[PDB]
Amino acid sequence: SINTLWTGINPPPNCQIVENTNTNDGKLTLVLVKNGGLVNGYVSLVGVSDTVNQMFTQKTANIQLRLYFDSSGNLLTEESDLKIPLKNKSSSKAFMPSTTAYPFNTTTRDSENYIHGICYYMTSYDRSLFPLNISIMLNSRMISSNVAYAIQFEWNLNASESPESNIATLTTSPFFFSYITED
Amino acid sequence: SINTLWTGINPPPNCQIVENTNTNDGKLTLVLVKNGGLVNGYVSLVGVSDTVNQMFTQKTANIQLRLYFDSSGNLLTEESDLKIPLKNKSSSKAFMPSTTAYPFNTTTRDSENYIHGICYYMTSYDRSLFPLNISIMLNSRMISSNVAYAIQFEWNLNASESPESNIATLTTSPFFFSYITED
Amino acid sequence: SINTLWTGINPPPNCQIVENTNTNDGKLTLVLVKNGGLVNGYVSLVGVSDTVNQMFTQKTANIQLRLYFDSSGNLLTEESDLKIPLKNKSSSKAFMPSTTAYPFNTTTRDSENYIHGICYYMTSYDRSLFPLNISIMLNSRMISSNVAYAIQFEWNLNASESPESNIATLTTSPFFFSYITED
């Protein structure tokens, strides 16, 4: 119990997808559950701005969300794309990605710093599914400051046709993952 | 501990795949584990009737299983395709899908009510794998009555060739998922 | 708490990929977490020997790792490809695959003894992703002795082109799974 760090169910716009957009244009739902040596995660994204919700009118698209954490395990909102700190339900460090399992400053050892999977986008018209490649990069590149941990999410759409012809709420079906915690 | 709602390991025929089949023609193994703000799930299906175990002689097939729950979190067996209530191992409401994260009566917000993935069918002859698209829909459509929650599973086979030439035990490899609980 | 059986984060070479190789040529990271009636798992592999790290110069490849356990839930290292016993973090039987859900000596019932999924290999040059079919077989074939449980991992590369032209650290992106425990 009380072993859950998250963005809260239906959070307000809390991240920035478009660079240079003083306003949050996306809604990221991230749920991290401590479960022994593993963190059980859940991640889905919803777009809010007209710009975000138009990215799927093109056959190709990329969305990246970077989370940087300090030694205590607190989200460094100024440097991260997620602008609202995570909470608990009703020791953030225990929800963080092991710097041992996932080491920093290493390209010789950067490969074991990635989780790769597939999630989907359901079109607004015929409700068809477009697969989205999703990658989660743990630690590895500490942007700067006193970044003690990092979690970067990236969704990539690479289709032969555009999933939408016009504005439609961008949504990424839920991607499940786990990673070894710093305990 | 005691935070697990399931159908029991090797249950008897407990669901109805073919509409209008007074008898249960399938064996659904569903395991739901409470783990903080997330339910960790496991689902696999085994076919029992000659009819079910012949669905894979065609290149296309669809199987749907709807679970409807009341406010307490109890399976409404008369309305659901699963006909035997779930049990525990030796607060069902805490195993239910958040009506906040996954709202009812909403097509404007029905997309974030789906989990989509792939699981597999292993042929009885050359043991080859056929991918099965699987979708889990949370709440969204409350069939009727005092349905407080809903979980619908759907497997879809869409192949160029038929996986089987004759009767063979239909089996769906295990699909893992998670969803935000009503806590 | 203390409900986690694993190989330890960055273990030393601990398994044998190439048959007849008195020395361990691979690093397997396996994390098993007890979570109610389900074990939550995480598995990734890193190759150490020049031979292992050359397997991806061919368009096709197969890697198999067999774990055999005794009644207590202890790894039988002499018969298994994993040569170092698992530990805990700071009742192995409770981390074992149910012999009920996953029965032995049964091909009539061998299909429900498999978990199938996809994980990836990131090439060393252009960092592209090659999908790897992964299969986990639970119990089913008890090699011999007093094998009370079995977990076999198998990764298969089947590409049109070879992912690498020369030696490169073989790595399999993390595959997540769950199975019903013997409780």
XYZ file of C-alpha atoms in Angstrom:
549
model
C 0.000 0.000 0.000
C 0.970 3.658 -0.599
C 3.548 2.267 -3.023
C 2.321 4.219 -6.015
C 3.707 7.351 -7.699
C 1.519 8.888 -10.437
C 0.139 11.861 -12.280
C -3.317 11.291 -10.787
C -6.149 9.877 -12.926
C -7.570 12.640 -15.155
C -4.853 15.315 -14.757
C -5.038 18.760 -16.367
C -2.811 19.527 -19.374
C 0.516 18.640 -17.742
C 3.206 18.271 -20.427
C 4.594 20.073 -23.459
C 4.728 18.210 -26.737
C 5.442 21.151 -29.021
C 8.722 22.856 -28.197
C 8.330 26.526 -27.292
C 4.724 26.405 -26.168
C 4.522 28.227 -22.853
C 1.283 26.250 -22.372
C 0.912 22.521 -21.716
C -0.563 20.875 -24.792
C -0.885 17.319 -23.669
C -2.272 15.106 -20.923
C 0.062 12.379 -19.804
C -1.244 9.632 -17.527
C 1.676 7.830 -15.962
C 1.273 5.339 -13.157
C 4.341 3.853 -11.442
C 3.844 1.077 -8.885
C 6.610 -0.209 -6.614
C 6.482 -3.986 -6.570
C 9.671 -5.465 -5.155
C 12.741 -5.006 -7.307
C 10.476 -3.892 -10.148
C 8.448 -0.818 -10.922
C 5.219 -1.694 -12.790
C 4.283 1.103 -15.147
C 1.403 2.350 -17.236
C 1.568 5.188 -19.693
C -0.922 6.837 -22.034
C -1.072 10.234 -23.638
C -3.936 12.530 -24.692
C -3.411 15.649 -26.831
C -5.114 18.963 -26.029
C -3.903 21.683 -28.379
C -5.078 22.078 -31.963
C -1.437 21.577 -32.948
C -0.972 18.339 -31.049
C -4.311 17.017 -32.314
C -3.248 17.595 -35.909
C 0.023 15.644 -35.766
C -1.804 12.549 -36.984
C -2.864 14.167 -40.298
C 0.650 13.269 -41.521
C 1.928 9.749 -42.227
C 4.880 10.335 -39.909
C 5.136 11.838 -36.427
C 7.243 11.780 -33.304
C 6.400 12.778 -29.773
C 8.966 12.852 -27.005
C 8.462 13.447 -23.306
C 11.449 13.693 -20.984
C 11.246 13.307 -17.224
C 14.274 14.304 -15.144
C 14.470 13.518 -11.421
C 16.687 14.609 -8.554
C 18.409 12.412 -5.948
C 15.290 12.344 -3.785
C 13.188 11.175 -6.734
C 11.347 14.431 -7.362
C 10.440 15.545 -10.849
C 12.535 18.483 -12.006
C 9.640 20.248 -13.781
C 11.604 23.133 -15.256
C 13.875 20.798 -17.264
C 11.291 18.074 -17.914
C 8.508 18.086 -20.519
C 6.110 16.957 -17.722
C 5.379 20.205 -15.771
C 3.421 18.972 -12.756
C 5.095 16.819 -10.097
C 3.956 13.266 -9.510
C 2.016 12.346 -6.371
C 0.841 9.275 -4.422
C -2.566 7.675 -3.864
C -5.108 8.288 -1.097
C 10.202 7.613 -1.012
C 10.104 8.667 -4.662
C 13.671 7.350 -4.885
C 12.281 3.804 -4.634
C 10.298 4.419 -7.838
C 13.421 5.445 -9.735
C 15.305 3.414 -12.388
C 18.403 1.719 -10.995
C 21.535 3.608 -12.095
C 23.254 0.241 -11.935
C 20.872 -1.617 -14.234
C 20.525 1.549 -16.355
C 23.833 3.493 -16.207
C 24.430 7.094 -17.298
C 27.031 8.479 -19.727
C 27.330 5.206 -21.677
C 26.681 4.531 -25.366
C 28.832 1.403 -25.117
C 26.108 0.458 -22.665
C 23.117 2.481 -23.856
C 21.258 -0.398 -25.528
C 20.243 -2.019 -22.232
C 18.864 1.412 -21.353
C 15.883 1.038 -23.674
C 12.460 -0.569 -23.469
C 10.779 -0.890 -26.905
C 7.207 -1.814 -27.606
C 4.139 -1.082 -29.649
C 0.960 0.713 -28.638
C -1.855 2.046 -30.788
C -3.800 4.982 -32.089
C -7.507 4.493 -32.876
C -8.679 6.769 -35.739
C -11.621 9.050 -35.127
C -13.544 7.993 -38.233
C -13.442 4.255 -38.952
C -11.833 3.499 -35.587
C -8.978 1.627 -37.185
C -5.745 1.011 -35.302
C -2.428 2.457 -36.255
C 0.554 0.951 -34.457
C 2.889 3.366 -32.680
C 6.430 2.383 -31.889
C 7.179 3.317 -28.329
C 10.548 3.574 -26.661
C 11.367 4.274 -23.074
C 14.903 5.318 -22.268
C 16.076 5.035 -18.691
C 18.666 7.437 -17.253
C 21.569 7.369 -19.758
C 21.551 11.089 -20.713
C 21.453 13.423 -17.680
C 20.473 16.679 -19.413
C 22.282 18.700 -16.765
C 21.922 20.115 -13.264
C 21.676 17.637 -10.406
C 19.632 15.172 -12.503
C 19.838 11.924 -10.505
C 17.444 9.928 -12.760
C 15.750 10.178 -16.161
C 12.792 8.557 -17.940
C 12.172 9.531 -21.556
C 9.097 8.387 -23.508
C 8.970 8.488 -27.256
C 6.091 7.543 -29.602
C 6.657 7.263 -33.324
C 4.073 7.002 -36.069
C 5.377 5.686 -39.392
C 2.499 4.856 -41.737
C 1.855 4.605 -45.487
C -1.208 6.807 -45.091
C -2.185 9.541 -42.650
C -4.436 8.270 -39.871
C -6.523 11.466 -39.844
C -7.624 14.072 -42.391
C -8.298 16.701 -39.733
C -8.113 17.652 -36.067
C -8.975 14.729 -33.788
C -8.012 14.090 -30.172
C -4.638 12.447 -30.243
C -4.612 9.429 -27.892
C -2.055 6.673 -27.390
C -3.422 3.364 -26.157
C -1.839 2.319 -22.807
C 1.675 0.833 -22.853
C 2.698 -1.426 -19.971
C 6.273 -1.853 -18.828
C 8.514 -2.659 -15.907
C 12.031 -1.646 -14.865
C 14.439 -2.521 -12.060
C 14.216 -0.050 -9.214
C 16.971 1.572 -7.170
C 15.352 -0.089 -4.133
C -1.782 -10.687 0.184
C -5.403 -11.724 -0.520
C -5.355 -8.998 -3.170
C -6.286 -11.271 -6.041
C -9.602 -11.773 -7.862
C -9.708 -14.646 -10.387
C -11.506 -17.468 -12.103
C -9.371 -20.046 -10.287
C -6.632 -21.955 -12.143
C -8.208 -24.739 -14.239
C -11.895 -23.697 -14.111
C -14.706 -25.705 -15.711
C -16.324 -24.407 -18.919
C -17.290 -20.963 -17.605
C -18.169 -18.672 -20.531
C -20.266 -18.616 -23.688
C -18.551 -17.832 -26.956
C -21.338 -18.867 -29.310
C -24.486 -16.822 -28.807
C -27.518 -18.919 -27.885
C -25.679 -21.880 -26.423
C -27.327 -22.699 -23.111
C -24.031 -24.469 -22.318
C -20.648 -22.875 -21.614
C -18.333 -23.573 -24.530
C -15.148 -21.986 -23.368
C -12.681 -21.859 -20.493
C -11.534 -18.394 -19.588
C -8.621 -17.968 -17.187
C -8.588 -14.425 -15.897
C -6.372 -13.305 -13.057
C -6.695 -9.779 -11.633
C -4.173 -8.618 -9.029
C -4.547 -5.408 -7.025
C -1.212 -3.629 -6.954
C -1.586 -0.027 -5.840
C -3.398 2.221 -8.275
C -3.095 -0.516 -10.894
C -4.713 -3.862 -11.485
C -2.255 -6.361 -13.035
C -4.095 -8.752 -15.304
C -3.639 -12.027 -17.117
C -6.056 -13.498 -19.590
C -6.129 -16.656 -21.692
C -8.917 -18.610 -23.289
C -9.431 -22.311 -24.077
C -12.286 -23.585 -26.268
C -14.354 -26.645 -25.323
C -17.192 -27.144 -27.789
C -16.770 -28.642 -31.247
C -18.092 -25.329 -32.570
C -15.614 -23.160 -30.709
C -12.746 -25.483 -31.648
C -13.592 -25.142 -35.329
C -13.533 -21.334 -35.489
C -9.882 -21.463 -36.516
C -10.590 -23.450 -39.721
C -11.494 -20.067 -41.267
C -9.042 -17.265 -42.077
C -11.133 -14.824 -40.051
C -12.740 -15.075 -36.614
C -13.894 -12.978 -33.705
C -14.520 -13.922 -30.114
C -15.999 -11.523 -27.602
C -16.452 -11.960 -23.874
C -18.266 -9.319 -21.846
C -18.022 -9.001 -18.083
C -20.495 -6.719 -16.303
C -20.101 -5.860 -12.612
C -22.292 -4.262 -9.972
C -21.376 -1.472 -7.531
C -19.879 -3.956 -5.083
C -17.672 -5.422 -7.815
C -19.547 -8.686 -8.279
C -19.885 -10.304 -11.668
C -23.412 -10.055 -13.031
C -23.415 -13.576 -14.531
C -26.815 -13.438 -16.198
C -25.817 -10.474 -18.402
C -22.140 -11.396 -18.793
C -20.637 -14.012 -21.123
C -18.610 -15.294 -18.107
C -21.160 -17.390 -16.110
C -19.274 -18.223 -12.917
C -18.374 -15.491 -10.420
C -14.759 -14.654 -9.713
C -13.159 -15.619 -6.401
C -10.012 -14.944 -4.337
C -6.963 -17.040 -3.451
C -6.373 -19.318 -0.460
C -13.394 -5.764 -1.820
C -14.072 -6.666 -5.449
C -14.691 -2.949 -6.004
C -10.941 -2.359 -5.607
C -10.327 -4.633 -8.612
C -12.669 -2.602 -10.800
C -11.710 -0.175 -13.611
C -11.850 3.456 -12.511
C -14.986 5.128 -13.909
C -12.930 8.304 -13.899
C -10.021 6.992 -15.954
C -12.484 4.943 -18.046
C -15.818 6.839 -18.220
C -19.180 5.470 -19.378
C -21.548 6.829 -22.048
C -18.761 8.565 -24.004
C -17.666 8.047 -27.612
C -16.036 11.484 -27.554
C -13.990 9.801 -24.851
C -14.197 6.115 -25.763
C -10.694 5.814 -27.239
C -8.954 6.011 -23.856
C -11.286 3.179 -22.864
C -9.364 0.608 -24.890
C -6.282 -1.527 -24.356
C -4.995 -3.093 -27.617
C -2.386 -5.769 -27.972
C -1.393 -8.946 -29.719
C -1.421 -12.504 -28.419
C -1.070 -15.770 -30.299
C -2.582 -19.018 -31.421
C -0.278 -22.035 -31.853
C -1.523 -24.411 -34.601
C -2.070 -28.039 -33.723
C -0.041 -29.419 -36.629
C 3.184 -27.524 -37.338
C 2.869 -25.489 -34.138
C 3.155 -22.219 -35.991
C 1.988 -18.971 -34.420
C -0.863 -16.906 -35.689
C -1.131 -13.438 -34.174
C -4.473 -12.486 -32.636
C -5.419 -8.876 -32.180
C -6.781 -8.413 -28.711
C -8.762 -5.500 -27.370
C -9.957 -4.856 -23.879
C -12.658 -2.261 -23.417
C -13.177 -0.822 -19.965
C -16.618 0.329 -18.788
C -17.873 2.668 -21.557
C -21.039 0.719 -22.522
C -23.167 -0.288 -19.503
C -25.414 -2.897 -21.149
C -28.198 -2.133 -18.692
C -29.423 -2.869 -15.179
C -27.299 -1.617 -12.300
C -24.042 -2.318 -14.184
C -21.431 -0.359 -12.201
C -18.398 -1.610 -14.211
C -17.600 -3.468 -17.437
C -14.637 -5.354 -18.922
C -14.990 -6.664 -22.467
C -12.372 -8.902 -24.114
C -12.206 -9.362 -27.834
C -9.839 -11.562 -29.893
C -9.688 -11.232 -33.651
C -8.039 -13.550 -36.138
C -7.377 -12.033 -39.563
C -5.110 -14.291 -41.622
C -4.382 -15.021 -45.293
C -4.790 -18.731 -44.619
C -6.798 -20.743 -42.108
C -4.720 -21.829 -39.123
C -6.455 -25.223 -38.912
C -8.037 -27.677 -41.353
C -10.116 -29.359 -38.655
C -11.218 -29.380 -35.026
C -8.373 -28.483 -32.664
C -8.481 -27.044 -29.153
C -8.728 -23.319 -29.536
C -6.246 -21.602 -27.186
C -5.152 -17.980 -26.916
C -1.669 -17.410 -25.546
C -1.719 -15.254 -22.356
C -2.174 -11.485 -22.728
C -0.872 -9.244 -19.946
C -2.334 -5.854 -19.145
C -2.897 -3.285 -16.446
C -5.574 -0.672 -15.746
C -6.153 2.067 -13.178
C -8.329 0.868 -10.334
C -11.206 2.599 -8.567
C -9.118 2.274 -5.383
C 8.354 -6.877 0.580
C 11.086 -9.540 0.227
C 8.835 -11.070 -2.428
C 11.412 -10.969 -5.188
C 13.586 -13.725 -6.685
C 16.257 -12.585 -9.176
C 19.682 -12.865 -10.703
C 20.764 -9.592 -9.087
C 21.153 -6.424 -11.185
C 24.453 -6.562 -13.111
C 25.375 -10.252 -12.639
C 28.591 -11.804 -13.957
C 28.433 -14.104 -17.003
C 25.861 -16.551 -15.618
C 24.462 -18.687 -18.457
C 25.614 -20.777 -21.402
C 24.251 -19.950 -24.821
C 26.650 -22.026 -26.896
C 26.415 -25.723 -26.106
C 29.691 -27.219 -24.892
C 31.270 -24.038 -23.599
C 32.629 -24.786 -20.143
C 32.486 -20.995 -19.658
C 29.389 -18.815 -19.284
C 28.993 -16.702 -22.402
C 25.978 -14.653 -21.553
C 24.497 -12.358 -18.925
C 20.879 -13.026 -18.148
C 18.941 -10.532 -16.035
C 15.789 -12.170 -14.769
C 13.574 -10.589 -12.155
C 10.607 -12.513 -10.723
C 8.216 -10.709 -8.374
C 5.518 -12.473 -6.356
C 2.318 -10.478 -6.608
C -0.674 -12.509 -5.480
C -1.599 -15.389 -7.741
C 0.755 -13.971 -10.366
C 4.488 -13.744 -10.788
C 5.512 -10.501 -12.553
C 8.613 -11.076 -14.628
C 11.316 -9.193 -16.462
C 13.916 -10.742 -18.689
C 16.796 -9.397 -20.761
C 19.955 -10.956 -22.079
C 23.457 -9.615 -22.799
C 26.090 -11.618 -24.705
C 29.720 -11.799 -23.556
C 31.687 -14.197 -25.740
C 32.951 -13.361 -29.216
C 30.804 -16.261 -30.422
C 27.599 -15.056 -28.813
C 28.236 -11.498 -30.009
C 28.548 -12.692 -33.595
C 25.227 -14.555 -33.776
C 23.578 -11.421 -35.143
C 25.814 -11.297 -38.258
C 23.411 -13.889 -39.727
C 19.806 -13.236 -40.776
C 18.626 -16.096 -38.571
C 19.467 -17.084 -34.997
C 18.075 -18.893 -32.000
C 19.021 -18.675 -28.363
C 17.548 -20.948 -25.732
C 17.963 -20.823 -21.976
C 16.472 -23.544 -19.796
C 15.884 -23.191 -16.074
C 15.044 -26.321 -14.078
C 13.916 -26.115 -10.444
C 13.485 -28.592 -7.615
C 10.488 -28.999 -5.284
C 11.774 -26.271 -2.978
C 12.087 -23.854 -5.901
C 15.870 -23.881 -6.172
C 17.612 -23.636 -9.507
C 19.216 -26.912 -10.531
C 22.345 -25.277 -12.010
C 23.998 -28.413 -13.348
C 21.046 -29.208 -15.649
C 20.040 -25.606 -16.382
C 21.678 -23.190 -18.833
C 21.630 -20.560 -16.017
C 24.611 -21.555 -13.778
C 24.234 -19.256 -10.775
C 21.293 -19.643 -8.386
C 18.737 -16.885 -8.027
C 18.610 -14.758 -4.877
C 16.358 -12.215 -3.123
C 16.616 -8.467 -2.522
C 18.145 -6.582 0.410
C 9.955 -19.513 -0.337
C 11.258 -19.938 -3.881
C 8.372 -22.372 -4.390
C 5.978 -19.398 -4.353
C 7.797 -17.974 -7.393
C 7.311 -21.184 -9.357
C 4.875 -21.791 -12.257
C 1.742 -23.637 -11.163
C 1.921 -27.289 -12.266
C -1.852 -27.099 -12.463
C -2.056 -24.098 -14.779
C 1.049 -25.369 -16.620
C 1.070 -29.205 -16.486
C 3.985 -31.515 -17.314
C 4.118 -34.451 -19.754
C 1.330 -33.068 -21.972
C 1.418 -32.153 -25.665
C -2.372 -32.457 -25.777
C -2.067 -29.636 -23.273
C 1.276 -28.048 -24.145
C -0.127 -24.993 -25.945
C -1.334 -23.319 -22.742
C 2.228 -23.839 -21.522
C 3.605 -21.060 -23.711
C 3.898 -17.293 -23.462
C 4.781 -15.661 -26.823
C 5.823 -12.102 -27.412
C 8.172 -9.800 -29.232
C 11.203 -7.945 -27.921
C 13.955 -6.162 -29.811
C 17.576 -5.936 -30.773
C 19.069 -2.476 -31.408
C 21.886 -2.585 -34.016
C 25.257 -1.176 -33.074
C 25.593 1.031 -36.154
C 22.385 2.811 -37.173
C 20.616 1.780 -33.966
C 17.735 0.247 -35.851
C 15.419 -2.256 -34.191
C 15.110 -5.848 -35.192
C 12.160 -7.688 -33.674
C 12.917 -10.924 -31.830
C 10.235 -13.505 -31.301
C 10.334 -14.635 -27.721
C 8.724 -17.690 -26.211
C 8.582 -18.764 -22.626
C 7.652 -22.352 -21.920
C 6.486 -23.243 -18.441
C 7.138 -26.692 -16.949
C 5.874 -29.163 -19.596
C 9.184 -31.000 -20.248
C 10.960 -32.092 -17.038
C 14.420 -32.861 -18.452
C 15.015 -35.447 -15.747
C 16.083 -35.856 -12.130
C 13.797 -34.419 -9.471
C 12.883 -31.409 -11.651
C 9.789 -29.975 -9.932
C 9.469 -26.894 -12.215
C 10.847 -25.537 -15.495
C 11.086 -22.157 -17.245
C 12.576 -22.091 -20.736
C 13.299 -18.847 -22.613
C 13.805 -18.772 -26.330
C 14.641 -15.796 -28.595
C 14.470 -16.131 -32.352
C 15.788 -13.750 -34.974
C 14.318 -14.210 -38.453
C 15.254 -11.291 -40.708
C 15.712 -10.592 -44.428
C 19.095 -9.039 -43.703
C 21.708 -9.567 -41.004
C 21.466 -6.993 -38.225
C 25.257 -6.780 -37.837
C 28.293 -7.115 -40.107
C 30.645 -7.854 -37.217
C 31.027 -8.504 -33.501
C 28.716 -6.308 -31.422
C 27.345 -6.839 -27.922
C 24.259 -8.942 -28.296
C 21.420 -7.469 -26.198
C 17.724 -8.311 -26.048
C 15.431 -5.480 -25.017
C 13.426 -6.345 -21.845
C 10.404 -8.648 -22.188
C 7.675 -8.420 -19.552
C 5.422 -11.310 -18.630
C 3.338 -12.862 -15.900
C 2.368 -16.419 -14.961
C 0.152 -18.081 -12.361
C 2.126 -19.133 -9.319
C 1.964 -22.338 -7.295
C 1.047 -20.119 -4.322
